[PDB]
């Protein structure tokens, strides 16, 4: 089992969630998930074809992955907040402490020193903020909606928090970090869990509409 394979793998996985959310499609909610597995697609694609695998001192870094993160969960964001009905104010400040994680991550992993551990951390401190949005604001928001919608923002939300949670210690014992796990079993910890967090994630969508 070979690194492209499990690009590959991922890529397919993509492409069939993303051709089941446009056939579904409230349009906003159905053309929102088409761009978070839509976007992954492409960015599986182009690393199962080779492309943006960029050496950095010992190890190599995927770059498609960080631009796809870096555009598709502020996306993943933006559907949990329709959903918890935020004013367009609260919008913003999820999304910049979304932002602020996915670029730390995207500069630590192309910075071949130590340094990278201090942009890391930034990334984590922004992360729990974004979790207490998650779990507080955006929960008591979502309160005042329809008891179906809120139920599904809790389940969604609590898919979210949790899986999100795993990321940062995957990236840690890989070879962005400490370098322990492989290559190989990194990428398919990491494959797996993009799939469950956009297309698991859109089932449930589709399942509770
Ligand atoms: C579809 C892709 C998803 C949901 C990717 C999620 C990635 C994360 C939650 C990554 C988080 C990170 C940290 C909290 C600290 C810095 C390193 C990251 C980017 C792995
Ligand atoms: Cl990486």
New binding site residues.
């Given amino acids: 089992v070979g690194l492209t394979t499990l690009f590959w793998l991922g890529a397919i996985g993509m492409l069939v969630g993303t051709l089941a959310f446009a056939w579904a499609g409230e349009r906003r909610y159905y053309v929102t998930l088409v761009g978070?597995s839509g976007i992954?697609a492409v960015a599986y694609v182009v690393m199962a074809l080779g492309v943006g695998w960029v050496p950095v001192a010992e190890r190599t870094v995927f770059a498609p992955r960080?631009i796809?993160?870096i555009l598709?969960?502020p996306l993943?964001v933006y559907f949990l907040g329709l959903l918890a009905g935020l004013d367009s104010r609260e919008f913003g400040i999820v999304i910049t402490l979304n932002t602020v994680?996915?670029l730390?991550?995207?500069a630590?992993?192309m910075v071949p020193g130590i340094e990278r551990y201090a942009?890391?951390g930034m990334?984590?401190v922004?992360?729990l903020g974004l979790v207490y949005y998650l779990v507080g604001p955006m929960t008591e928001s979502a309160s005042q909606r329809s008891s179906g919608i809120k139920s599904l923002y809790v389940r969604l939300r609590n898919l979210?928090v949790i899986?999100?949670?795993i990321?940062?210690f995957?990236?840690?014992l890989g070879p962005?970090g400490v370098a322990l796990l492989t290559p190989t079993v990194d990428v398919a910890l990491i494959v797996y869990?993009?799939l469950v967090?956009?297309v698991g994630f859109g089932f449930i969508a589709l399942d509770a509409a």
């Fill in positions: 978070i992954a960080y796809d993160w598709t969960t993943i994680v996915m730390a991550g995207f630590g992993a942009l890391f990334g984590a922004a992360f979210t899986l999100w949670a990321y940062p995957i990236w840690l962005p869990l993009d967090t956009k």
